[PDB]
Structures are given as C-alpha cells and as structure tokens.
Design a protein around this ligand. Structure first.
Ligand SMILES: CC1(C)[C@H]2CC=C(CN3CCC[C@@H]3CO)[C@@H]1C2
Ligand code: NI
Length: 332
C-alpha cells in the first residue's frame, strides 16, 4: 500500500506515488523528477492529472508517452493554485527538471517536500524564506557524518584536467563517460568542451537530452560517433570487457580509452588494464551530511519525515538521533 510519507495530509495530493494503482482520495499526482524509482508505474495508459516541471513534462510525453491532456507543467518560483490549494515549485539542485514542492494547506500549515535534492545556501533566498515551514519531507539519502563529498565544481575541475592531459599526451585516446539516467550531464559536457568536441551517443540517449532545455544543446551533442572524441555508453558497459569491445568497434581510430564512472579528490587513481583506465569520480546530486544539517538548522521545521532509508528500524533510529542533535544544538 502507499506509504504515509508519500501522502500530503489535508489534501487530495500524493508525491511520487505512481506504483500503487488508483490511490483512494487522490485528485492530483505530483512528480518531483524523472528518475525511475520515483516515476515507477507511470506509462502511456495513465489517466489522472500529473503536476510537474516543464522539463519533467517533456520527458513524460516523449519517453513514457503519457498523453498530453494529463500533463500539467508549472513554472518555478511562482504561486499557483491547484484544486483549490496554493503550491510553489522550487529548484531542487538534483537532475534537470527536479523540484521541491511547497504546499500551503487550507488550515494554515505549510509543508515542504524536497523530492531528491542537494541542499545549497542559495535555497535560503527563495519563496522558502517568506514564511514558517511546519513539516519537512526530507531526502535523507546520505544522513550520516561519514558522507563528505567535494563540491561539484572541484570534481569537474579534476575531470577536465585529467582528460585534457591524457588526450594532449596521446591524440589517439578516446574518452568514454557512463550514464543510466538523467543527471550529472556537466561531467561529459565539460570534458567535451575542453577537448573541442561534441559528445557522441545513441539515438535513445540523444532523444532524452533533447527534452532537457539545455541552452545551445545542438552545438554540444551528436549521434555521429565517428565525429566525436567523447562517447557516452550505458553505465553497465563501463568495465574492461565492455570498453575493449567498444574500442574494437571504432575501426582502429583509437588505441587507448580513458573512462569515467560518476558514482581526497587530488589523490584519486584509476583502475587500469593495458590501454584502458577507469576513474570513479564522486559527483553527487544529493546533499552531503553537512549540507543537509545546515539546511535543516536554517529552516527550523517542527516535524521531519524522512523519505529515504525508511525500511529498517536501525536506519530510522539513526536518523531520528541526528534530527534531535541538530534541534538541541540550534535551539528550535
Ligand atoms: C544514511 C544512513 C542513515 C543509512 C544508509 C547508510 C548509512 C551509513 N552506514 C555506513 C556505516 C554505518 C551505516 C550502516 O551501513 C546510514 C544507514
Ligand atoms: Ni533522483
């Protein structure tokens, strides 16, 4: 059955709740972003209203074939009325089109649902700051202090420098980048830009990227693999066997592969077999522990409801202990 943490009390709304059939009482289904665990169950035969960002709506139409009449895109940073309730969509700093949702309940309660997010201090300057928020439905993916990661900018600097050095030393090296969902496009776009190349990919991945409203996208990507020295492959193919196989297909154009898997940064080393090297780089689209803690201590919610790691009693207890520490430290 549909879990409590996907229902919005005092409304006919659910969030990311498409795998449970017709949810009794639901007059509007919100979708925070186009990742498969969240859209699970949506298909071309869905016949209820779906509320989402413009980008998410482009993907629903073109990739899942949801009929146009059921797709309700909303602009960001704008007060909108849906089935008699004021809502705002905010940028989640996750993947393209990903949003947080602010609900202004008829009874005066205000609820924030983060969807999946990477907390940032810039979130402290939006409509979020204009009123008190009582309940927070929180992306707790990395809610433990061992989760430190570098800034996205630091990780991209490492990738650009690594690729440029390798290809300047050997002009016959190919760069390959793994993907299995939308998100983390900066990794392959930044590398291709330093190398003066478009990014080559399958027709299916090209279609997906053409839905994302990226400026000047036609100048950056292509389906002509032969013209490109940065290729995208499915994440499952980023291993010595898959990459050896890909090199054979390039017809003797290349004699080395440098590959990236976007799972201290200065000290990161690759796995190497012969003329193939694979780098795992810590590019995150979710909050680190410290980023999450800063956001929650600024927001000062009355109640937090985790939406990730909820399946075990140990995980639930661990998260509850951190929420109480944070509250006692900051005095709310
Ligand atoms: C974020 C979490 C609340 C859930 C997922 C991962 C966690 C961190 N791990 C690494 C070692 C200690 C602990 C158990 O796997 C916490 C349990
Ligand atoms: Ni996600």
């Amino acid at each position: 059955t549909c879990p409590f943490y996907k229902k919005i009390p005092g409304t006919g709304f659910t969030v990311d709740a498409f795998q449970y059939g017709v949810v009794e009482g639901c007059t509007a289904y919100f979708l925070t972003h186009f990742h498969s665990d969240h859209y699970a169950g949506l298909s071309k035969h869905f016949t209820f209203p779906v509320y989402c960002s413009e980008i998410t709506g482009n993907l629903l139409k073109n990739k899942l074939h949801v009929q146009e009449q059921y797709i309700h895109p909303l602009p960001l940073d704008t007060e909108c009325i849906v089935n008699g309730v004021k809502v705002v969509l905010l940028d989640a700093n996750h993947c393209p089109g990903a949003v947080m949702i602010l609900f202004y309940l008829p009874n005066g309660t205000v609820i924030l649902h983060t969807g999946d997010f990477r907390a940032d201090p810039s979130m402290e300057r939006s409509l979020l700051a204009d009123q008190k928020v009582h309940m927070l439905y929180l992306d707790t993916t990395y809610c433990s202090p061992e989760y430190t990661f570098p800034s996205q900018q630091e990780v991209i600097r490492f990738a650009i420098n690594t690729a440029f050095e390798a290809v300047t030393l050997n002009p016959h090296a190919l760069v390959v980048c793994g993907t299995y969902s939308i998100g983390k496009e900066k990794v392959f776009l930044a590398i291709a830009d330093v190398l003066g190349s478009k990014v080559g990919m399958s027709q299916e991945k090209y279609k997906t990227l053409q839905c994302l409203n990226i400026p000047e996208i036609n100048s950056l990507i292509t389906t002509d693999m032969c013209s490109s020295l940065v290729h995208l492959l499915p994440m499952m193919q980023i291993n010595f066997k898959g990459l050896q196989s890909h090199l054979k297909k390039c017809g003797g154009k290349y004699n080395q592969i440098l590959a990236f898997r976007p799972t201290r940064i200065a000290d990161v080393i690759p796995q190497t077999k012969g003329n193939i090297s694979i780098y795992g780089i810590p590019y995150s689209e979710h909050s680190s522990y410290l980023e999450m803690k800063r956001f929650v201590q600024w927001l000062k919610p009355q109640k937090i409801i985790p939406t990730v790691n909820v399946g075990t009693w140990k995980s639930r207890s661990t998260m509850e202990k951190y929420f109480r520490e944070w509250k006692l430290e900051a005095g709310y």
